[PDB]
Amino acid sequence: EPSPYVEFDRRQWRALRMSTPLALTEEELVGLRGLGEQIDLLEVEEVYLPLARLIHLQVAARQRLFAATAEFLGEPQQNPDRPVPFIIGVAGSVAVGKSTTARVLQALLARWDHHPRVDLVTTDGFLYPNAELQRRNLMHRKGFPESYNRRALMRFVTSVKSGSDYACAPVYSHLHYDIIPGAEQVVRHPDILILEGLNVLQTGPTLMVSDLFDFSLYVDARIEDIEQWYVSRFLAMRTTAFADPESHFHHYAAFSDSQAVVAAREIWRTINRPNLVENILPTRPRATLVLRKDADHSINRLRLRKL
Ligand X SMILES: Nc1ncnc2c1ncn2[C@@H]1O[C@H](COP(=O)(O)OP(=O)(O)CP(=O)(O)O)[C@@H](O)[C@H]1O
HSE toward the beta carbon, residue 176, CA cutoff 13 A: 10
Q: How many residues bind ligand X (CB under 6 A)?
A: 14
The site string for ligand X over 80-99 (x = CB under 6 A, - otherwise) reads: --------------xxxxxx
Q: Which is nearer to ligand X, 136 or 176 (CB)?
A: 176
**Shortest CB 94 distance to a second copy, Å:** 20
277 assigned ligand-binding residue? no
**Shortest CB 235 distance to ligand X, Å:** 9
97 in the Ramachandran plot: left (φ > 0), alpha (ψ -120 to 50) or beta? left
Determine the Cα–Cα distance for residues 121 and 135; give it in Å rounded to an integer: 26
68 binds, among a second copy, ligand X, none (CB under 5 to 8 A by kind): a second copy
Determine the Cα–Cα distance for residues 143 and 123; give it in Å rounded to an integer: 9
22 binds, among a second copy, ligand X, none (CB under 5 to 8 A by kind): none
Pick the binder of a second copy from 25, 38, 134, 203 (CB under 8 A). 203
- Give yes or no for residue 144 binding ligand X (CB under 6 A): no
- Give yes or no for residue 189 binding a second copy (CB under 8 A): no
Q: Which is nearer to a second copy, 212 or 235 (CB)?
A: 212
Pick the binder of a second copy from 38, 262, 285, 294 (CB under 8 A). 285
- Give yes or no for residue 147 binding ligand X (CB under 6 A): no
61 binds, among a second copy, ligand X, none (CB under 5 to 8 A by kind): a second copy
Mode of pairing for the β-strands spanning 86-91 and 299-305? unpaired
Give the SS3 label for residue 289: strand
Exposed e or buried b per residue across 266-287, where buried means at least 16 C-beta atoms within 10 angstroms of its C-beta: ebbeebbbebbeebbbebeebb
Question: How far is CA 44 from each of CA 10, 135, 196, 218, rounded to the nearest angstrom?
Answer: 12, 44, 19, 17
- Give yes or no for residue 100 binding ligand X (CB under 6 A): yes
Using CB under 6 A as the binding rule, the residues of this chain from 5 to 64 that contact ligand X are 34, 37
Determine the Cα–Cα distance for residues 258 and 90; give it in Å rounded to an integer: 33
Question: How far is CA 275 from each of CA 61, 93, 141, 202, 269, rounded to the nearest angstrom?
Answer: 35, 8, 9, 12, 10
Determine the Cα–Cα distance for residues 240 and 35; give it in Å rounded to an integer: 9
96 assigned ligand-binding residue? yes
Determine the Cα–Cα distance for residues 7 and 301; give it in Å rounded to an integer: 7
DSSP lists the bridge partners of residue 24 as none
Q: How many residues bind a second copy (CB under 8 A)?
A: 44
**Options 106-114, 229-237, 260-268, 280-288: segment touching a second copy (CB under 8 A):** 280-288
Q: Which of 88, 89, 11, 3 is nearest to 305 (CA)?
A: 3
Contacts to ligand X by CB under 6 A: 34, 37, 94-100, 174, 233-234, 241, 249
Contacts to a second copy by CB under 8 A: 1-4, 6, 15-16, 53-54, 57-58, 60-62, 64-69, 71-74, 155, 158-159, 161-164, 203-207, 211-212, 282, 285-286, 304, 306-307
Which amino acids are annotated as binding site for ATP, given as ranges? Answer: 92-99
Which amino acids are annotated as binding site, given as ranges? Answer: 92-99
